[PDB]
Design an enzyme around this catalytic site. Structure first.
Site, PDB file in Angstrom:
ATOM      1  N   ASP A 262       0.861  -1.234  -0.157  1.00 50.00           N
ATOM      2  CA  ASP A 262      -0.096   0.122  -0.030  1.00 50.00           C
ATOM      3  C   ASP A 262       0.871   1.134  -0.099  1.00 50.00           C
ATOM      4  O   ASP A 262       2.252   1.121  -0.206  1.00 50.00           O
ATOM      5  CB  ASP A 262      -0.870  -0.072   1.330  1.00 50.00           C
ATOM      6  CG  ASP A 262      -2.197   0.623   1.198  1.00 50.00           C
ATOM      7  OD1 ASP A 262      -2.200   1.606   0.420  1.00 50.00           O
ATOM      8  OD2 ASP A 262      -3.310   0.299   1.490  1.00 50.00           O
ATOM      9  N   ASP A 375      -5.891   2.328  -7.108  1.00 54.99           N
ATOM     10  CA  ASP A 375      -7.182   2.898  -5.925  1.00 54.99           C
ATOM     11  C   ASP A 375      -7.558   4.186  -6.437  1.00 54.99           C
ATOM     12  O   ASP A 375      -6.747   4.876  -7.059  1.00 54.99           O
ATOM     13  CB  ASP A 375      -6.417   2.735  -4.807  1.00 54.99           C
ATOM     14  CG  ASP A 375      -7.594   2.535  -3.559  1.00 54.99           C
ATOM     15  OD1 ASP A 375      -8.771   2.645  -3.840  1.00 54.99           O
ATOM     16  OD2 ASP A 375      -7.069   2.826  -2.339  1.00 54.99           O
ATOM     17  N   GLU A 378     -12.412   6.425  -8.973  1.00 56.24           N
ATOM     18  CA  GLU A 378     -13.892   7.055  -9.007  1.00 56.24           C
ATOM     19  C   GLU A 378     -14.059   8.165  -9.955  1.00 56.24           C
ATOM     20  O   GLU A 378     -15.057   8.177 -10.619  1.00 56.24           O
ATOM     21  CB  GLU A 378     -14.616   7.260  -7.697  1.00 56.24           C
ATOM     22  CG  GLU A 378     -14.659   5.927  -6.773  1.00 56.24           C
ATOM     23  CD  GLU A 378     -13.538   5.272  -6.321  1.00 56.24           C
ATOM     24  OE1 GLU A 378     -12.583   6.132  -5.922  1.00 56.24           O
ATOM     25  OE2 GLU A 378     -13.552   4.105  -6.097  1.00 56.24           O
ATOM     26  N   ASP A 443     -14.131  -0.034   1.111  1.00 51.20           N
ATOM     27  CA  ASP A 443     -13.594   0.252   2.579  1.00 51.20           C
ATOM     28  C   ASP A 443     -14.704  -0.214   3.275  1.00 51.20           C
ATOM     29  O   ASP A 443     -15.197   0.419   4.162  1.00 51.20           O
ATOM     30  CB  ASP A 443     -13.206   1.529   2.364  1.00 51.20           C
ATOM     31  CG  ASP A 443     -11.867   1.900   1.767  1.00 51.20           C
ATOM     32  OD1 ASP A 443     -11.165   1.103   1.309  1.00 51.20           O
ATOM     33  OD2 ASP A 443     -11.433   3.243   1.738  1.00 51.20           O
TER      34      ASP A 443
HETATM   35  C1  LIG Z   1      -7.995   3.035  -1.115  1.00 51.88           C
HETATM   36  C2  LIG Z   1      -8.146   1.309  -0.933  1.00 51.88           C
HETATM   37  O1  LIG Z   1      -9.868   1.405  -0.971  1.00 51.88           O
HETATM   38  C3  LIG Z   1      -7.976   0.797   0.448  1.00 51.88           C
HETATM   39  O2  LIG Z   1      -8.075  -0.573   0.060  1.00 51.88           O
HETATM   40  C4  LIG Z   1      -6.466   1.166   0.577  1.00 51.88           C
HETATM   41  O3  LIG Z   1      -5.875   0.435   1.725  1.00 51.88           O
HETATM   42  C5  LIG Z   1      -6.493   2.761   0.866  1.00 51.88           C
HETATM   43  C6  LIG Z   1      -5.203   3.350   1.230  1.00 51.88           C
HETATM   44  O4  LIG Z   1      -4.189   3.100  -0.060  1.00 51.88           O
HETATM   45  C7  LIG Z   1      -7.247   3.652  -0.046  1.00 51.88           C
HETATM   46  O5  LIG Z   1      -8.093   4.409   0.464  1.00 51.88           O
HETATM   47  S1  LIG Z   1      -7.783   5.842   1.122  1.00 51.88           S
HETATM   48  O6  LIG Z   1      -7.150   5.785   2.182  1.00 51.88           O
HETATM   49  O7  LIG Z   1      -6.420   6.137   0.163  1.00 51.88           O
HETATM   50  O8  LIG Z   1      -8.858   6.795   0.774  1.00 51.88           O
END
Ligand SMILES: *[C@H]1[C@H](O)[C@@H](O)[C@H](O)[C@@H](CO)[C@@H]1OS(=O)(=O)O
Ligand SMILES: O=C([O-])C(=O)[O-]
Length: 780
Positions: A262, A375, A378, A443
């Site tokens: 991540d 990620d 949208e 999420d």
């Molecule tokens: C995007 C994804 O939905 C989630 O699985 C990721 O772990 C996180 C972090 O990269 C992202 O959400 S966010 O925190 O950047 O909004």
């Protein structure tokens, strides 16, 4: 007030002219029609269609009051005054325009009484979305649970109990009103964009889905490793931590194919680095070595990327210089305040943005990256005055992720033409499966409600093209301490859904290897089971590539003439043969399973149940979730491996569920090298088929292999066939005319070629399955 004026045929397409303007009708196949209003004008092109330019030869006939434009099965009936198009399969009415097209963009159709309507993509509203209204604007729903009208991946499409699919082929901020405002009206609306819809018909739900994916795109077979165990969290903070996690899988004896990195791979904070798109060297000092060290252990590395480049990032000045970012109307880079900081968005619709972004993916892929996670497509934030090469934010919004996938897919096919790309993304459009998109449901909160919604979401996405829809296993959002029972239930269900990827915010561990002894003792054999079941899962994947058939199928497939089954979102089919009922509340002591009539076996215990309609009550336990096997199933297994890089089918074990109620049954196992994108097209595969014939005095199996094979294919597989619910009256076995006696003792304790276990009602056959046809005949 609209009326027919005249029509022309042009290149197999019908061009109608009304008082309001031109309408282009083109059949994209024999069961699919594209209807383009305002055809005279400049519009965004189709996004939904795999072959936008195609138009097959249809026939046209004229009457006083009507025109009729027909392909094979689907017929468009155009009433002249007032102007209204309706759609027929044979002479059954599928769908009729009401006022039809208007101004804003607006389409209005009649709904028939009793018609049930699935669709919208990801919503948590009930399987039948009739009576609901909701927007067509991809948007985050952080921490959702048991309700949502608007999430990451909407689809502007519906599937009806009349067995048609309707696509609004429009990328813009919009809305769908499914007989909510007015009982009998389906209304589609958008602020802007293309004024087109696509109607697809079928004789059954499988045929409908085959016809739909024919014209919208077939998912190319993913790499077999995408059917494996992922290690993921948000997020590994360092190379040391990522390496310690790969190690934990090895020291805890859980299978592991892929580790997912991540946003800490490019910076030490959540805020302020996004767009760096390069290694944070203070925390990932030797990443090429890391990836190569993992590849030695048969483990792949997947990296997160996002559409945004922050002004605080190392790549801001360069992206501006290269004109890679979307602009304001004044012509300069559009910056806006994301959570992560002030930044821009990469314009994947432009030549310059596509080349700049693609070059970054190329470079990282060369370093050792096997796969890609996109990620926030949208896009997560997308201000309305943002300008893309082909339109403003509100016009292109719902197609951003779709084009992002296309761009990355073409790029990976160009760099590695002998590999299957892995592209995991949160938001797309109808047809995004043709670029290999593997979506997840965002999420989700760490609640039972979050889990209880996953089947509804998965089936809704599966029905409209997306076979590899899955959830963050165990849940993603918030929580302060692990909910052990919910975690276990979610990872059990995981085994019987498309991608095995536990993932969550890292204050609570997502990965099964970091759980307590009881949790690991429960999940370890299940994760292994997922590996032992690869021939079952990979064969369903193969059928999805071939026909659209989703891996998860809804209960309603079991009886197309009982529309009440459409409401079921608690039991589903995993492939042809397994009816799964996940446990989605704490402390549940038993379940009632609405098993279709016929004979069913408990997967875990071998108990036989027959039912003429009534549900079955199964007790529950903490070590499993209720799974029934259909009589006549062939369930294929291979020995468990730690990684699909070691996958072999030299040893097969096949379990056949016999019952006289099923006098003919078939199975198939699709084997190829697990990696070649052209395996199916070039026939570089081994396709094992199995046919059972079950009469009063005999049980006959015919085994065969087709295809040209592939490099490293075993010529001869050691095969154990286990017949469950086998009669105790079989005296002899013939294998290709050679008679073999059936032993009735010590099956588990001798190298018996044929042995009946009287206590378990199982007849075990052990033989060599080579390239030639094989017949096994049991007779009383
Ligand atoms: C995007 C994804 O939905 C989630 O699985 C990721 O772990 C996180 C972090 O990269 C992202 O959400 S966010 O925190 O950047 O909004
Ligand atoms: O059904 C059979 O074949 C039996 O059980 O004996």
């Amino acid at each position: 007030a609209v009326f027919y004026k005249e029509h022309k045929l042009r290149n197999d397409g019908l061009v109608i002219t009304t008082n309001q303007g031109n309408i282009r009708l083109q059949f994209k196949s024999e069961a699919a029609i594209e209807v383009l209003y305002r055809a005279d004008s400049k519009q965004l092109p189709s996004f939904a269609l795999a072959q936008p330019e195609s138009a097959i030869k249809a026939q046209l006939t004229e009457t006083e009051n009507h025109l009729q434009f027909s392909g094979g099965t689907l017929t468009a009936r155009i009433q002249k005054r007032p102007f209204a198009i309706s759609y027929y399969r044979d002479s059954e009415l599928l769908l009729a325009e009401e006022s039809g097209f208007q101004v804003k963009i607006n389409f209005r159709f009649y709904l028939s009484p009793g018609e049930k309507i699935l669709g919208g993509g990801q919503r948590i509203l009930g399987m039948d979305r009739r009576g609901q209204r909701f927007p067509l604007y991809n948007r985050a729903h952080y921490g959702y649970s048991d309700h949502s009208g608007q999430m990451y991946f909407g689809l502007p499409a519906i599937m009806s109990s009349k067995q048609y699919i309707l696509v609004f082929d429009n990328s813009a901020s919009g809305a769908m009103d499914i007989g909510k405002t007015e009982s009998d009206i389906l209304q589609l609306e958008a602020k802007s964009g293309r004024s087109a819809y696509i109607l697809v018909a079928g004789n059954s739900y499988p045929s409908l889905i085959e016809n739909f994916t024919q014209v919208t795109g077939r998912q190319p077979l993913p790499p077999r490793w995408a059917l494996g165990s992922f290690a993921s969290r948000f997020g590994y903070r360092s190379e040391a931590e990522t390496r310690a996690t790969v190690q934990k899988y090895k020291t805890e004896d859980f299978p592991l194919d892929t580790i997912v990195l991540d946003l800490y791979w490019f910076g030490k904070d959540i805020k302020g680095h996004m767009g760096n798109l390069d290694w944070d060297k203070e925390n990932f000092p030797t990443p090429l070595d890391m990836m190569a060290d993992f590849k030695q252990q048969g483990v792949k590395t997947v990296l997160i990327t996002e559409p945004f480049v922050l002004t605080s990032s190392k790549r801001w000045d360069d992206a501006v210089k290269a004109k890679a970012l979307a602009k304001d109307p004044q012509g300069q880079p559009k910056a806006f305040e994301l959570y992560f900081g002030n930044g821009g968005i990469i314009d994947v619709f432009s030549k310059e943005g596509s080349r700049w972004f693609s070059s970054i993916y190329k470079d990282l892929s060369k370093q050792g990256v096997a796969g890609w996670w996109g990620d926030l497509g949208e896009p997560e934030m997308h201000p309305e005055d943002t300008q893309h090469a082909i339109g403003d934010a509100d016009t292109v919004h719902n197609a951003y992720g779709h084009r992002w996938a296309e761009m990355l897919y073409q790029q990976q096919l160009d760099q590695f033409p002998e590999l299957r790309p892995f592209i995991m993304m949160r938001a797309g459009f109808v047809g995004s499966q043709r670029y290999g998109m593997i979506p997840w449901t965002g999420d989700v909160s760490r609640t039972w409600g979050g889990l209880a919604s996953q089947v509804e979401l998965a089936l809704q996405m599966s029905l409209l093209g997306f076979g590899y829809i899955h959830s963050d296993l165990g849940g993603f959002a918030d929580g302060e301490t692990l909910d052990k029972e919910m975690y276990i239930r979610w990872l059990q269900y995981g085994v019987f859904q498309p991608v095995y990827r536990p993932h969550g915010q890292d204050h609570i561990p997502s990965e099964p290897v970091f759980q307590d002894e009881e949790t690991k003792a429960i999940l370890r054999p299940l994760v292994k089971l997922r590996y032992r079941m690869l021939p079952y899962i990979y064969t369903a994947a193969y059928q999805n590539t071939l026909t659209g058939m989703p891996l998860m199928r809804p209960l309603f497939f079991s009886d197309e003439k009982n529309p009440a089954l459409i409401d079921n979102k608690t039991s589903y089919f995993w492939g042809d043969s397994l009816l799964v009922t996940p446990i989605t509340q704490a402390g549940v002591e038993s379940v009632s399973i609405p098993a279709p009539k016929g004979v069913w076996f408990d997967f875990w215990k071998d108990t036989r149940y027959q039912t003429d309609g009534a549900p079955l009550t199964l007790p529950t336990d903490l070590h499993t979730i209720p799974v029934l096997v259909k009589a006549g199933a062939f369930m294929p297994y291979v020995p468990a491996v730690s990684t699909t890089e070691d996958y072999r089918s030299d040893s097969l074990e096949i379990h056949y569920y016999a019952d006289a109620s099923v006098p003919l049954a078939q199975g198939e196992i699709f084997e190829d090298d697990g990696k070649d994108p052209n395996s199916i097209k070039r026939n570089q595969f081994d396709l094992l088929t199995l046919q059972a014939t079950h009469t009063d005095n005999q049980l006959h199996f015919q085994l065969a292999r087709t295809g040209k094979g592939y490099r490293g294919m075993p010529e001869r597989r050691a095969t154990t066939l286990v017949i469950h619910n086998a009669s105790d009256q079989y005296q002899h076995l013939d294998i290709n005319g050679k008679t073999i006696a059936i032993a009735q003792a010590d099956c588990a304790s001798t190298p018996a070629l044929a042995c009946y276990d009287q206590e378990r009602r199982q007849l075990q056959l052990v033989f060599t399955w080579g390239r030639e046809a094989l017949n096994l005949r049991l007779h009383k």
